[PDB]
């Protein structure tokens, strides 16, 4: 996260770290949506242009974390993966359309002050809150600048951007399964996700019921915190029927 701040303890108790077993390293962010399901970006798990195609046994998820590199004894919990599910129409060939995946944990994780699931939006919460200018929050352990790494989880709040502005900022084809967020050059304030944040959540706190909802997944960008560029996020609500189908079936 560029131009963010240190998270407070327990500020993002749904935040998950996707961790490569060997070599041991941060792969991506992710989010906890129940005691046994974790949501992330498909490109965190499958991206053939970069020879990326992880299997369950290659990875762990670390839940309840604050420090990036420390083993947070008595606080974090480490879970193995039972099964990875990639959206069947995830478009890794072109523009990362439908950049979403689920991971089922081998065993349920115990909730605590540091570990708690985020809500997924309903149609009405999405319609109300997914509006240009409305701010969400992105969290992660990714790089602090494009060209370095944080001691603890970082947080930044960013406004959703009007779709024509998102479209006009890039040559990549945008779809209805994406939204973009970030400040405009004339707005002064700055901030973005960066390498290592992808797969993590873009959340909004509903003013109707005071619950946090995951509206987006950190999906793609062109640089980090560049003027006139915006971060792109998977539109979680648009893909929720697939999430539900997977959870109901498996």
């Amino acid at each position: 996260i560029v131009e963010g701040s240190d998270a407070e303890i327990g500020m993002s108790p749904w935040q998950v770290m996707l961790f490569r077993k060997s070599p041991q390293e941060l792969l991506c962010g992710a989010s906890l949506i129940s005691d046994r399901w974790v949501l992330t970006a498909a490109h965190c798990l499958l991206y053939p242009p970069w020879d990326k195609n992880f299997t369950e046994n290659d990875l762990l998820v670390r839940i309840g974390k604050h420090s990036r590199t420390r083993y947070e004894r008595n606080i974090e919990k480490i879970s193995m993966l039972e099964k990875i599910y990639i959206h069947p129409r995830y478009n890794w060939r072109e523009n990362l359309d439908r950049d979403i995946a689920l991971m089922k944990l081998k065993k349920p994780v115990a909730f605590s002050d540091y570990i708690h699931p985020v809500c997924l939006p309903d149609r009405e919460t999405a319609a109300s809150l997914l509006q240009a200018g409305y701010k969400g929050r992105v969290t992660g352990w990714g790089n602090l600048k494009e060209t370095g790494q944080p001691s603890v989880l970082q947080v930044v709040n960013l406004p959703i951007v009007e779709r024509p502005v998102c479209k006009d900022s890039t040559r990549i084809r945008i779809t209805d399964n994406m939204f973009c967020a970030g400040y405009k050059p004339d707005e002064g304030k700055r901030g973005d996700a960066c390498e290592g944040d992808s797969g993590g959540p873009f959340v909004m706190k509903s003013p109707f019921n005071n619950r946090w909802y995951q509206m987006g997944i950190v999906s793609w960008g062109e640089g980090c915190d560049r003027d006139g560029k915006y971060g792109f996020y998977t539109h979680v609500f648009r893909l929720k029927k697939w999430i539900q189908k997977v959870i109901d079936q498996f």
């Binding site: 077993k21 041991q24 390293e25 941060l26 762990l60 590199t69 083993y71 480490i78 193995m80």
Partner: peptide, 11 residues
């Protein structure tokens, strides 16, 4: 870069 995690999670 990362502190080693308990071996039980790597078995």
């Amino acid at each position: 870069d990362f502190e080693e995690i308990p071996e039980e999670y790597l078995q």
